[PDB]
Structures are given as structure tokens and as C-alpha cells.
């Protein structure tokens, strides 16, 4: 019912391949590929504040689902997109050629980002605090 | 008397002044000044693994107290220095013209970085898992 929490990355697939596909330099990719950090979500109804840690970067995005917002991506580009909430537990959007699904089941968020033939999947676990 | 844990940044003083002094790009200073993320320490005796979130960056460093190590700073520069343990609860190091003190007080960690007339102070709180 609520996405709010601090989430410890547990495992991911295709980090290097995804970051390569979107144009990040290999030297940066190798520096961040094995970090497993903590991302935070604060949900208040349709409103979300994301503090995402991915690789060597921290990105802070804010959006209300259903409203167009400017979201910073891993390339530094700020993309205009709308994130929708399907049910109470799935956040979906598309930007550039990437389909993103953020799904909360119990305490586990599965984030699946699909770019052509690359499925970049992150599994994180809510720190029960 | 263990530093180990995950710590959420609670407050900080003089981020912008310190980051300017070390020459961080202004765009990174403005993006990162309000981010309050989670850093992690793993301590094994004198050996420490740090996953530090500072501004928009994640930095992973690894060293042993009393032995010279190579550490990545906030600018990405590599520096060679020795980290000492002071008074059994403070990690202290001096690299270039910076003195860093990382002090443990129960669930609170205070990182104080002094550069000339600038004292960059971070106060973080242990996440109870
Ligand atoms: C426009 C969206 C921002 C894209 C930033 C890409 C970095 C990976 C995105 C995954 C974060 C989704 C939240 C779940 C927690 C996590 O996996 O860290
Ligand atoms: C080797 C020098 C450290 C790298 C430079 C990072 C600048 C900020 C350092 C924060 C100290 C991290 C340790 C305690 C946790 C925290 O305060 O987040």
C-alpha cells in the first residue's frame, strides 16, 4: 500500500550492459557496478520523493503520479515523463526508449528497466526500521 | 565500540564552502547540497570498508588503520594517507590540507573536515535494522 522506506540493493542484472547502452563511460561503469547501496522512497498518496543510489551516483527526483515532471536520469539528462501508479504497488513510465517498472511485493522492490534487448533488473529489500 | 552500520545523514554545515574549496564543479554542488543519504561502514578490527554518500556521489574506500592506503576523495582524486584511531572512538586522517575526524557516539557519527577556516560537519544517525 505504501512505497515509503529505505531499500538496500540485494542483487542486480545487466547493470554494465544497461549503463553502456545509455552512453556512460566504461571507466565509470566499472567503478560503480559492485556497489550495493540504499535508496529511499517517501510516498504521500500520489506524491513521491526518490533518493536513488545507483552505481557511483545519487539522484534525487520528485514527482506526483499522473503529472508530467522532470526526472534526472543516469546520463544527467532531465527527461519529461509521466509516471503512473497501477494498483497500489506498481510505478510505470517510459522515457526515451526505456520502459521502467517499479514493483513492490511485501518488502521487496523489483525495478525492471527494458532498453531494446537489455533487461536491467534491480532487487532491493526494505530495511524494516 | 564498533563503527559498523548504515548511517543516514541528519544535518550538515558548510557543504557548499567545503566543496567550493576542494573545487567540486558548481553544478555538482548545487545538485548535491540538499541530498541526505545513507552511508555504510563495515569494520573488522583495524580494517574498514566505507561506502560514503556525499552530495550526488557515492565513494567506496577501504583501509586499515595505521597502514598507508590509497583513498578516493570527493573530487575523484586519489590520495595516499594513513588513518589513525584516536581515543578508541575517532578515526582521524590528514591528507593534503584537510583534517578529517570521524567520531562515534553511540548511534551518532560526526564527521568533521577542517580545511583552513572552513569546518565541514556532517551528523548522521545509525539505521536500526
Ligand atoms: C527517470 C527515472 C530515474 C532513472 C535512474 C536510474 C537508476 C536506477 C533506477 C532504480 C531505482 C528505482 C527504485 C528502487 C530502488 C533501487 O533499485 O535502487
Ligand atoms: C578519504 C576522504 C573521504 C572522502 C571524501 C568524502 C567527503 C565526505 C566524507 C563523509 C565521511 C563519511 C564517514 C561517515 C558517514 C557520513 O558522514 O556520511
Amino acid at each position: 500500500s505504501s512505497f515509503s522506506g529505505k531499500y538496500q540493493l540485494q542483487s542486480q542484472e545487466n547493470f554494465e550492459a544497461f549503463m553502456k547502452a545509455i552512453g556512460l563511460p566504461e571507466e565509470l561503469i566499472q567503478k560503480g557496478k559492485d556497489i550495493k547501496g540504499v535508496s529511499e522512497i517517501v510516498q504521500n498518496g500520489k506524491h513521491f520523493k526518490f533518493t536513488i543510489t545507483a552505481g557511483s551516483k545519487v539522484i534525487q527526483n520528485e514527482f506526483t503520479v499522473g503529472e508530467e515532471a522532470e526526472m534526472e536520469t543516469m546520463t544527467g539528462e532531465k527527461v519529461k515523463t509521466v509516471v503512473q501508479l497501477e494498483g497500489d504497488n506498481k510505478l510505470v513510465t517510459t522515457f526515451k526508449n526505456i520502459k521502467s517498472v517499479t514493483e513492490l511485493n511485501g518488502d521487496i522492490i523489483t525495478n525492471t528497466m527494458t532498453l531494446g534487448d537489455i533487461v536491467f533488473k534491480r532487487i532491493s529489500k526494505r530495511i524494516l526500521e
Side-chain angles (χ1 to χ4, degrees), chain A:
Chain A
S1 191
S2 171
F3 279 82
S4 291
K6 293 177 183 72
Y7 294 87
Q8 169 69 57
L9 188 62
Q10 303 300 106
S11 66
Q12 65 189 336
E13 293 178 339
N14 286 322
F15 177 92
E16 300 95 321
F18 185 90
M19 299 305 165
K20 255 177 280 137
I22 69 176
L24 307 198
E26 287 191 353
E27 34 269 309
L28 177 57
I29 294 174
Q30 301 301 308
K31 201 161 80 90
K33 68 179 176 68
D34 290 322
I35 303 164
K36 288 182 170 62
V38 178
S39 297
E40 184 165 4
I41 311 177
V42 183
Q43 177 184 0
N44 191 351
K46 292 190 303 182
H47 184 269
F48 293 82
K49 179 186 180 170
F50 277 76
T51 309
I52 294 164
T53 184
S56 307
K57 298 191 175 178
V58 182
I59 297 172
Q60 199 155 244
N61 283 331
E62 182 181 351
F63 56 86
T64 301
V65 290
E67 308 290 316
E68 189 173 45
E70 210 155 54
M71 270 57 92
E72 181 182 11
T73 68
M74 287 296 289
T75 66
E77 188 175 339
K78 274 146 177 274
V79 298
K80 281 178 169 251
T81 201
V82 181
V83 183
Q84 304 291 3
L85 180 63
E86 295 185 353
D88 56 14
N89 73 319
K90 189 183 299 190
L91 296 163
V92 303
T93 193
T94 305
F95 60 99
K96 303 175 85 173
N97 284 324
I98 301 158
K99 238 236 56 61
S100 178
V101 179
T102 303
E103 186 172 342
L104 174 73
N105 300 287
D107 288 328
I108 293 290
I109 282 185
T110 305
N111 201 76
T112 307
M113 300 172 81
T114 298
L115 179 47
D117 56 333
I118 299 165
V119 183
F120 170 41
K121 181 175 75 173
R122 291 165 63 89
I123 302 182
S124 301
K125 182 164 67 175
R126 183 155 47 194
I127 304 169
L128 280 234
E129 99 202 66

